[PDB]
Amino acid sequence: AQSKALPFLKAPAKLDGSLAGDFGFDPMGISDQVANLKYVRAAELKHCRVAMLGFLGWVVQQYVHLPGEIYAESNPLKALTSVPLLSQIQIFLFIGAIELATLDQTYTADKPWDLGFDPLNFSKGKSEQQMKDLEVKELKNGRVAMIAIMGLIAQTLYTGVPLF
Amino acid sequence: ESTYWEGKAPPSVVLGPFLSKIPSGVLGPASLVALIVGSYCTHESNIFNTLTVDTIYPAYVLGSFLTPISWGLHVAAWIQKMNKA
Amino acid sequence: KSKAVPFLPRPAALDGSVVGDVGFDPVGFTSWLPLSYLQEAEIKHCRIAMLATLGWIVADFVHLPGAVHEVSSLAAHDVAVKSGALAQILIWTSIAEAISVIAISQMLEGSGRQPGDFKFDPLNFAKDEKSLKKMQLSELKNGRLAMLAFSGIVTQAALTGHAFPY
Ligand code: CLA
Ligand SMILES: C/C(C=C=C1C(C)(C)C[C@H](O)C[C@@]1(C)O)=C/C=C/C(C)=C/C=C/C=C(C)/C=C/C=C(/C=C/[C@@]12O[C@]1(C)C[C@@H](O)CC2(C)C)CO
Ligand SMILES: CC(/C=C/C=C(C)/C=C/[C@@]12O[C@]1(C)C[C@@H](O)CC2(C)C)=C\C=C\C=C(C)\C=C\C=C(C)\C=C\[C@@]12O[C@]1(C)C[C@@H](O)CC2(C)C
Ligand SMILES: CC(/C=C/C=C(C)/C=C/[C@@]12O[C@]1(C)C[C@@H](O)CC2(C)C)=C\C=C\C=C(C)\C=C\C=C(C)\C=C\[C@@]12O[C@]1(C)C[C@@H](O)CC2(C)C
Ligand SMILES: CC(/C=C/C=C(C)/C=C/[C@@]12O[C@]1(C)C[C@@H](O)CC2(C)C)=C\C=C\C=C(C)\C=C\C=C(C)\C=C\[C@@]12O[C@]1(C)C[C@@H](O)CC2(C)C
């Protein structure tokens, strides 16, 4: 009834109105245990962003490579082992440096997903409806990418073909 | 509710809202049939014919599971009979 | 008192339902289970049997967009579980049924979901209540006929080997 995604079920109590992308999709009632939807939305958006970047990297590594030889592997899962540990540890350290401040931030803030990242100011001057539309676009694209990046990983692990 | 009882038989609510509405004249014969079927299945899988890897027969196994069940069915049959059902 | 069985009395739980209540319950199964759960089971069986009868009949006549699909809908089960199609259909059917547990559990508990209702009318073949009731009765009658017909089809096509007459 109240779920748009599952037009027959009634959504849970915490799925209503605000927090764009709310289509009443919580059949298992996971939202009933979390105190709020702030942390789960932060986790969902982090997954969405990481999955978008992962899909883009998957395709680009399929087609484009860095000039060096160590980056010449086309299969992303094979490149996970071919690439030297120095590059991967540098990436991990960069991510952890970004992650510790946001670790302090996420567990207490009202909008843990709002990291203040807008270098090009794509949100300055946008109205509330436009901002909500942008949030919906981001969430949609992220969910589709998550499904897609998991599918790419599965098909590479099951057939060895990284794409198509 | 109030499954607690002190009379001769417990209230029919202790049987659940599926056995609470079965007449005792149905549960009784059903319990006896289930007990006979389960005993025969147990005695056909084993005892009369020795068990082997090639002879397991899910019917006899599933059947044999009716013996433990039978116990519950006739207990419920007695409970229904004493509760004017 | 019963409309279907004049001898036996009308079932206590069957008074009126647009699902085709003609008071046919000689064994009193409606006393055992909630009527709503039995209605959901009946509608599920109806739809499955209709789809299966149509699929069996069609797949014996014109079904070969490939090589592994050159079977006679009697050896089709093993061939196409070996191929892997039945696995995918089972996966999606399991997802739908797991969702259906909550649908069955949201009814029998409150809400307003009628048995067998999934709000799937994309083409809007039913418009008002009268059309909805008429076509619910039609769907259930067709589904019962399809249940019996598929039973006959499998029993005959296993008692012999033949085509559509079976
Ligand atoms: C990391 C994954 C992740 C996380 C944390 C969330 C989190 C959230 N989603 Mg969400 N979503 C995701 C992935 C995720 N989503 C994907 C991939 C899709 C596309 C199908 C969606 C589609 C979607 C819709 C349409 C809606 C939500 C909503 C919500 C919010 C409320 C539901 C909730 O509390 O569930 C928390 C969820 C988890 C804790 C994840 C548990 C992990 C389970 C067990 C998944 C198990 C694996 C799965 C069955 C199969 C994956 C393998 C492969 C096939 C992909 C919450 C912020 C609702 C919303 O906006 O509310 C504000 C809403 O309406 N989501
Ligand atoms: C690519 C392909 C095959 C192939 C090819 C080529 C590339 C095309 C050509 C080459 O030459 C060969 C080859 C092999 O490569 C395509 C395959 C065919 C598809 C993709 C079709 C799928 C069939 C769907 C079926 C059969 C589903 C049945 C429905 C059920 C519903 C169940 C329900 O109970 C549920 C769960 C809820 C209930 O409420 C009611 C209902 C709804 C009835 C199952 O009962
Ligand atoms: C799909 C997914 C999560 C799906 C979860 C779903 C659907 C859950 C749905 C539900 O909970 C709700 C919503 C509500 C509940 O009531 C009901 C259910 C149904 C239970 C996460 C994907 C998450 C996908 C992620 C995080 C992708 C990460 C990408 C990474 C890590 C990067 C990898 C690479 O770097 C390597 C490894 C090597 C390089 O060569 C290549 C690249 C690609 C660059
Ligand atoms: C990357 C992406 C968006 C990236 C946006 C970025 C970085 C924007 C960053 C900024 O805005 C901020 C944040 C703040 C601004 O102030 C600054 C900038 C910097 C401007 C979306 C991708 C979104 C990506 C999506 C939605 C991908 C969907 C993929 C699908 C459907 C793939 C399917 C398949 O892969 C399978 C599954 C199997 C294959 O075999 C077959 C096919 C079909 C190829
Ligand atoms: C499939 C079927 C109906 C399917 C309808 C569907 C999917 C409609 C779906 C939708 O409408 C909804 C739901 C919502 C709409 O908004 C959208 C769509 C998507 C359009 C009926 C089958 C119905 C199948 C029936 C009725 C079977 C009849 C068989 C009979 C009568 C007997 C035959 C035999 O006697 C012979 C001929 C010879 C003997 O040897 C053998 C036997 C078998 C014994």
Side-chain angles (χ1 to χ4, degrees), chain A residues 1-123 125-128 130-164, chain B, chain C residues 1-62 65-69 71-126 128-129 131-132 134-150 152 154-161 163-166:
Chain A
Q2 199 176 351
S3 34
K4 298 188 187 75
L6 300 140
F8 35 103
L9 298 174
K10 316 194 83 44
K14 279 186 202 75
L15 297 193
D16 65 336
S18 57
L19 283 72
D22 204 297
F23 304 136
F25 186 74
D26 198 325
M28 294 299 291
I30 308 187
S31 66
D32 281 329
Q33 287 86 240
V34 293
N36 63 7
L37 287 191
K38 297 181 195 309
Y39 182 90
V40 297
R41 184 37 76 78
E44 181 194 19
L45 278 170
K46 193 174 291 195
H47 284 95
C48 284
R49 296 149 183 177
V50 172
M52 290 174 207
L53 286 185
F55 178 79
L56 191 54
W58 204 278
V59 183
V60 170
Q61 291 168 42
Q62 282 316 119
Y63 296 157
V64 187
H65 289 119
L66 284 185
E69 190 276 331
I70 59 182
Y71 322 105
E73 182 65 26
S74 66
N75 191 300
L77 294 186
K78 291 190 199 301
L80 193 58
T81 70
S82 161
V83 159
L85 195 59
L86 187 57
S87 304
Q88 303 177 3
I89 189 63
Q90 273 155 315
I91 295 168
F92 176 77
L93 289 189
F94 179 61
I95 292 163
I98 302 195
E99 275 288 332
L100 286 179
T102 59
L103 180 138
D104 191 17
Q105 188 274 151
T106 45
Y107 297 105
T108 54
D110 291 331
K111 281 166 75 185
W113 57 89
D114 183 19
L115 298 198
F117 181 67
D118 203 358
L120 304 192
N121 267 33
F122 280 179
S123 166
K126 302 283 188 288
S127 78
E128 184 44 48
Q130 286 143 263
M131 265 322 288
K132 196 199 193 79
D133 177 80
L134 271 168
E135 302 186 334
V136 166
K137 285 182 182 292
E138 166 185 41
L139 277 152
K140 247 135 241 212
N141 291 281
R143 294 156 174 179
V144 176
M146 299 207 272
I147 301 290
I149 185 59
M150 294 299 291
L152 287 169
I153 291 170
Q155 84 173 60
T156 311
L157 278 182
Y158 184 48
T159 53
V161 186
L163 200 69
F164 299 116
Chain B
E1 293 179 353
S2 179
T3 54
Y4 177 77
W5 56 290
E6 293 179 353
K8 182 63 70 177
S12 297
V13 299
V14 304
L15 313 176
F18 173 43
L19 289 178
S20 311
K21 316 168 214 305
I22 308 292
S24 169
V26 173
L27 279 176
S31 77
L32 183 63
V33 164
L35 166 77
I36 279 167
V37 161
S39 287
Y40 178 83
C41 287
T42 297
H43 293 81
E44 182 65 26
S45 186
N46 290 318
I47 297 164
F48 297 158
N49 307 141
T50 186
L51 210 52
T52 314
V53 193
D54 291 331
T55 61
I56 296 298
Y57 305 140
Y60 300 153
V61 182
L62 272 173
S64 299
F65 300 157
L66 281 172
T67 6
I69 293 156
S70 87
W71 184 81
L73 274 189
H74 63 86
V75 166
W78 186 87
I79 289 172
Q80 286 278 54
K81 173 183 71 161
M82 294 299 291
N83 281 306
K84 298 293 183 182
Chain C
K1 288 189 73 75
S2 158
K3 179 140 195 303
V5 182
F7 293 100
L8 277 74
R10 183 180 63 83
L14 304 177
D15 63 358
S17 48
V18 289
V19 301
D21 197 346
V22 304
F24 185 54
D25 190 15
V27 290
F29 280 155
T30 50
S31 84
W32 294 12
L33 277 297
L35 179 54
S36 305
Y37 184 89
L38 299 163
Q39 283 172 323
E40 179 95 0
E42 179 190 31
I43 298 188
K44 181 163 305 174
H45 281 103
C46 278
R47 297 159 170 174
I48 291 178
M50 305 164 88
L51 273 179
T53 310
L54 179 61
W56 186 293
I57 283 171
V58 166
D60 244 329
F61 270 123
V62 64
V68 297
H69 320 270
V71 288
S72 44
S73 301
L74 192 77
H77 175 260
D78 294 5
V79 165
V81 301
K82 182 175 73 175
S83 82
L86 274 291
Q88 305 207 235
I89 317 170
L90 176 87
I91 284 157
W92 288 102
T93 303
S94 301
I95 283 161
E97 283 303 300
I99 295 309
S100 298
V101 189
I102 298 155
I104 297 164
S105 278
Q106 278 193 15
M107 65 180 288
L108 299 174
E109 164 200 270
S111 74
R113 173 181 183 264
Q114 300 299 320
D117 193 299
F118 285 113
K119 299 292 181 70
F120 174 67
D121 205 356
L123 292 203
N124 212 26
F125 285 155
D128 63 358
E129 190 276 331
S131 62
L132 183 55
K134 169 175 187 274
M135 294 177 71
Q136 273 180 18
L137 162 70
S138 303
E139 165 202 43
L140 277 158
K141 285 182 103 160
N142 285 118
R144 296 151 181 186
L145 173 60
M147 283 182 233
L148 301 175
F150 178 78
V154 288
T155 309
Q156 291 152 230
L159 268 193
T160 185
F164 169 76
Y166 299 125

